[PDB]
C-alpha cells in the first residue's frame, strides 16, 4: 500500500512521500 497525495491536507511530510494519482 501507499500514501495517496489526495489526503495529504497541509502536511509537508505526507506531501514529500505520497503518490499522485
Amino acid at each position, epitope marked *: 500500500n501507499f500514501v495517496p*497525495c489526495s489526503i495529504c491536507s*497541509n*502536511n*509537508p*511530510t505526507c*506531501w*514529500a*512521500i*505520497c503518490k*499522485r494519482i
Partner: single-chain antibody
C-alpha cells in the same frame, strides 16, 4: 559548495506570464526540496510553494495556486517557476531556495541555501493559515548590546520555527532552525529559544555585521509563513 543561480530580471505588463529558472550545483539535486519565496520592494517574505525534484510532487500557497506552476529538470539540475496572469502587486524579487535536509527525501523546510533572486517588475497601469507576528518591528542598538527579538505564532507550531537574517540588498540567511538549533557557520552569539507559540532570537553581543532585518518562519504546516520582520538599526 552549494550554489543556486537564478535567471535574469524580467519586465512585464499586467496580464502576461513569466517563467523563472534556478540552476543548482554542488549537491545531490534530488535529495533536497526546491522552493520559492518572493519579496515585494520594502516588504517582507512570502512563501509561494514547494517542489520535489525526487518525485515531482508540488504544493502551492492557495493565494497563488491557480496562477503558478513549479517544475524541476533532474537532467540539468534546474528548477522552474511560472507565474501567470500578472498583476501590479506581483512586482517583487523572487527567490528559489534549497529546503534543508529532512526526515524524508526532499521534504519542505527552512532554506539552508538561497538563489540570488530575480527581480520581476510588472509595469505600472496607473498613478496563511498560521500568521506570525514579531516584536519589536524596529529596534536600535549599539555594538556590544544584547538584542532580543520576539516571535509569536497564532497557533501552536511545536518547535518548527526558523530564524533568518537579511542584509540590505541580499538574500536572507538561515541562523536557527528547530527553534534552538544553530545553523552551521553561524556565530554562537546567536541563540533561539521557545516552543509552542512564543519564541525568541537573542544576539548576546551585537557586532557591526549584525545590523539587518530578522525574520521568523514557521514550517509546521503548509503554507509556510514568515513573520513581518524586525529591523535592527544603528542608534541615531
Amino acid at each position: 559548495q552549494v550554489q543556486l543561480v537564478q535567471s535574469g530580471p524580467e519586465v512585464k505588463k499586467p496580464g502576461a506570464s513569466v517563467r523563472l529558472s534556478c540552476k543548482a550545483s554542488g549537491y545531490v539535486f534530488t535529495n533536497y526540496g526546491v522552493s520559492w519565496v518572493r519579496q515585494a520592494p520594502g516588504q517582507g517574505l512570502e512563501w509561494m510553494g514547494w517542489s520535489s525534484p525526487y518525485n515531482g510532487n508540488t504544493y502551492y500557497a492557495q493565494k497563488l495556486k491557480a496562477r503558478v506552476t513549479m517544475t524541476t529538470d533532474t537532467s540539468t539540475n534546474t528548477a522552474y517557476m511560472e507565474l501567470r496572469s500578472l498583476r501590479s502587486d506581483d512586482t517583487a524579487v523572487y527567490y528559489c531556495g534549497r529546503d534543508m535536509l529532512g526526515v524524508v527525501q526532499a521534504v519542505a523546510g527552512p532554506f539552508d541555501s538561497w538563489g540570488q533572486g530575480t527581480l520581476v517588475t510588472v509595469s505600472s497601469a496607473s498613478g496563511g493559515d498560521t500568521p506570525m507576528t514579531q516584536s519589536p518591528s524596529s529596534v536600535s542598538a549599539s555594538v556590544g548590546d544584547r538584542v532580543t527579538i520576539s516571535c509569536r505564532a497564532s497557533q501552536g507550531i511545536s518547535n518548527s520555527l526558523a530564524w533568518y537574517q537579511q542584509k540590505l540588498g541580499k538574500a536572507p540567511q538561515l541562523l536557527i532552525y528547530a527553534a534552538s538549533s544553530l545553523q552551521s557557520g553561524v556565530p554562537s552569539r546567536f541563540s533561539g529559544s521557545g516552543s509552542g507559540t512564543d519564541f525568541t532570537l537573542t544576539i548576546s553581543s551585537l557586532q557591526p555585521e549584525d545590523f539587518a532585518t530578522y525574520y521568523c518562519q514557521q514550517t509546521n504546516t503548509f503554507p509556510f509563513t514568515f513573520g513581518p520582520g524586525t529591523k535592527v538599526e544603528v542608534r541615531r
